[PDB]
A paper describes a structure:
Human α-amino-β-carboxymuconate-ε-semialdehyde decarboxylase (ACMSD, EC 4.1.1.45) stands at a branch point of the de novo NAD+ synthesis pathway, starting from the essential amino acid tryptophan, and plays an important role in maintaining NAD+ homeostasis. In detail, ACMSD catalyzes the decarboxylation of 2-amino 3-carboxymuconate 6-semialdehyde (ACMS), an intermediate in the de novo NAD+ synthesis pathway, to 2-aminomuconate-6-semialdehyde (AMS), through a metal-mediated, O2-independent, non-oxidative decarboxylation reaction, which proceeds through a metal-bound hydroxide. ACMSD is catalytically inactive in the monomeric form and active in the homodimeric form since the neighboring subunit contributes with one of the two substrate-binding arginine residues. Similar to previously published X-ray structures, the active site of hACMSD is located at the C-terminal opening of the β-barrel and characterized by a Zn2+ metal ion coordinated with a distorted trigonal bipyramid geometry, by residues His6, His8, His174, His 224, the moiety of Asp291, and a conserved water molecule.
In this study, we report the crystal structure of the complex of human dimeric ACMSD with TES-1025 (4), the first potent and selective ACMSD inhibitor. The human ACMSD crystal structure in complex with TES-1025 at 2.5 Å resolution was refined to final Rwork and Rfree values of 0.210 and 0.252, respectively. The molecular replacement solution of the hACMSD structure in complex with TES-1025 comprised four monomers in the asymmetric unit to form two homodimers. In AB, two TES-1025 molecules were observed, while in CD no electron density was observed that could be attributed to a TES-1025 molecule. In homodimer AB, there are no disordered regions, while in homodimer CD there are disordered regions namely in chain C between residues 30–37, 178–185, and 242–253 and in chain D between residues 242–253. The carboxylic moiety of the ligand coordinates the Zn2+metal ion (Zn···O distance is 2.5 Å) and establishes an H-bond with the indole moiety of Trp191 residue (the H···O distance is 2.6 Å, and the N-H···O angle is 135.8°) while interacts with Asp291 through a water molecule. The pyrimidine ring interacts through the carbonyl group with Arg243 (the H···O distance is 2.5 Å, and the N-H···O angle is 143.6°), belonging to the neighboring subunit (chain B) of the functional dimer of ACMSD, while a second H-bond is established with the catalytic residue Trp188 (the H···O distance is 2.7 Å, and the N-H···O angle is 132.5°). The negatively charged nitrogen of the TES-1025 pyrimidine ring engages a charge–charge interaction with the positively charged nitrogen of the Arg47 (the N···N distance is 3.6 Å). The 2-thiophene ring fits into a hydrophobic cavity generated by Trp176, Phe46, Met180, and Trp191; this latter residue also makes Pi–Pi stacking with the phenyl ring of TES-1025.
Residue numbers in the entry:
A (entry chain B), B (entry chain A): 2 to 335
The structure:
Amino acid sequence: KIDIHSHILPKEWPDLKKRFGYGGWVQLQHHSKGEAKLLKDGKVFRVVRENCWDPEVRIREMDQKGVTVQALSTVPVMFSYWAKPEDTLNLCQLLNNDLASTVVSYPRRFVGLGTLPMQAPELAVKEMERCVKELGFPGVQIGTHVNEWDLNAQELFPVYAAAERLKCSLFVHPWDMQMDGRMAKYWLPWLVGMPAETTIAICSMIMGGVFEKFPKLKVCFAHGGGAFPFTVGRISHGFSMRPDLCAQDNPMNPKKYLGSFYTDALVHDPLSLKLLTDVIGKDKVILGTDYPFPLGELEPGKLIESMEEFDEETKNKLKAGNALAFLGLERKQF
Amino acid sequence: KIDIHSHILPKEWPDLKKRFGYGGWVQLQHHSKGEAKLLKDGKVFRVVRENCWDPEVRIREMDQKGVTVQALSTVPVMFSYWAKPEDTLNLCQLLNNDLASTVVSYPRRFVGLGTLPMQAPELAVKEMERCVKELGFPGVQIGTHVNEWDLNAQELFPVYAAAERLKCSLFVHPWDMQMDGRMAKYWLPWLVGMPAETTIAICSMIMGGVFEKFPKLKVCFAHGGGAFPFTVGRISHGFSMRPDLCAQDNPMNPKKYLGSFYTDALVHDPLSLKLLTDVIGKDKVILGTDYPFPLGELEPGKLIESMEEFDEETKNKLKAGNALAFLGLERKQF
Ligand SMILES: N#Cc1c(-c2cccs2)nc(SCc2cccc(CC(=O)O)c2)[nH]c1=O
Ligand SMILES: N#Cc1c(-c2cccs2)nc(SCc2cccc(CC(=O)O)c2)[nH]c1=O
Ligand SMILES: [K+]
Ligand SMILES: [K+]
Ligand SMILES: [K+]
Ligand SMILES: [K+]
Ligand SMILES: [Zn+2]
Ligand SMILES: [Zn+2]
């Protein structure tokens, strides 16, 4: 029904080294029909298909797979938290506007998840205010960390305060793992580095008092919380054993916040999905696909259809019900 | 009945900075009765009790907790893979001999797992052969990586080949995670760094072809494999979707290796333990405690015994049966 985890790019965008005056950016080249390359200062790193930018193609594959709504967000490599703040804000506004146009073209099939200049919180609050009031976005997508800041950093608290005030949902996506060293092999940053990033982000928001200070803030973590649903016992036990190290910014045990945030259902395995629903809750698991990248779910929702343990009310919660709750929307997409 | 995961230190050892000519080593200083300080070049990093060195104290606690046998291994901070090879080997002789003398004093309560100078595979094979033949150890404890080498590195294959031949089991313990920067907070190196170090180690051994090339090698991973039982779906899926990044040293899928290695049961929560035996297998999960450190299990086997889902045959496999099969020992312990 609803896919909370899908990425989209504009059909094109200007040379960002020319626009801003320094390198490190991502561009897009239509080298042949139906395909395109993603470059970084000339060096290609991935090839994408038409479904990465063309909404016409996405709607076709959405009807084919049974998907009703896609929550569109940018590709996390575009976060650009490393750049100068004024330049990231410029890029965020470019990416957010293209999202708004794609959503208003098919308001029954798309919702928008914006991008924020997280390195400059005063600018990110303003761009969030524009994303909610003007662009009508139900939420934004942010990384699991912002340069040397984990999501516990006090500098980020005005952004959380604004998001809780604006009723702006947060989708926390892992990015900027170590790409070299020992991690330059076996696709380790994707297979292991990204789940570790999400686990760090969950712990950092819990022990940083984020969920405590902003109880109404609605957060969702990608890839089923990473390793958190399995390692929560170790984390919870460690908090109890060393409160001098873990209980200084927030005194509550991390298990208290089970049921205070969401994760997506992208775990590929039924055993992993059952533990996910068992630990996080049947009301806090949302169907996500990572469309259109191949590391995601090929048949959206097939893993939830196959679970004989879930009743039909629970399947419909993971397929679409929990997405509506996290986004703060109603059933207006028949 | 059997605890495969417990650490012990010698009561004393000389000034290592003077023994080897450089700093960075660990010293044990007794400041009070029943307590001692661990120093890294004068700076304390934890206070330990007498049960970390005194075997008499361990015996009393083992009787009171119901533990028949402890597998004694050194504390991973003593791995010393960063130092000169001939100096780390010097330390391995000191640690393994002291480990050996504690086993001969109570030979039905202890078996030894020696330490090796893994940064010099040729010396490691020598000292390991000495451990098995001259000292009688059924295995050794090694880290999840040796400097820039992961456990897939072909430089370490002489260690694996000697292990299959000598019938020497490998207990792989996470160590040398990032300790500073973003990880310097909330005990993250132990709560998140250690499980991730172990997940990387399982992936490197699988995708490096270690289990295929040494099918009789007996390997056990610590802390329930870290994140592997929960994220094996994503790891297996990422292997099939990108054979050009993962399948260049071993074409077999990671799922085919569920059942080719052991993990301990140190996962603290019932749902984590049930998933652990669902993925790794009821015959490949071993009771481990991390004695005497507080992050471990205070009452060994209490979690296993409380599992209503398990039959008595399964509980005995986790309590002692799987440890004996992994260590390759018979019931010489009454
Ligand atoms: N290596 C490598 C490599 C790279 C990069 C190298 C350096 C910077 S990005 N990008 C891609 S495209 C899909 C994508 C790109 C960026 C973030 C995400 C988050 C997710 O959906 O999982 C997915 N595919 C690759 O294999
Ligand atoms: N931070 C910090 C910190 C440190 C260190 C800092 C730098 C080097 S060690 N050591 C201890 S003592 C038990 C122990 C020490 C070393 C490895 C293991 C593996 C296991 O869990 O069994 C346990 N406790 C701490 O909290
Ligand atoms: K919202
Ligand atoms: K920053
Ligand atoms: K053995
Ligand atoms: K137990
Ligand atoms: Zn994604
Ligand atoms: Zn340990």
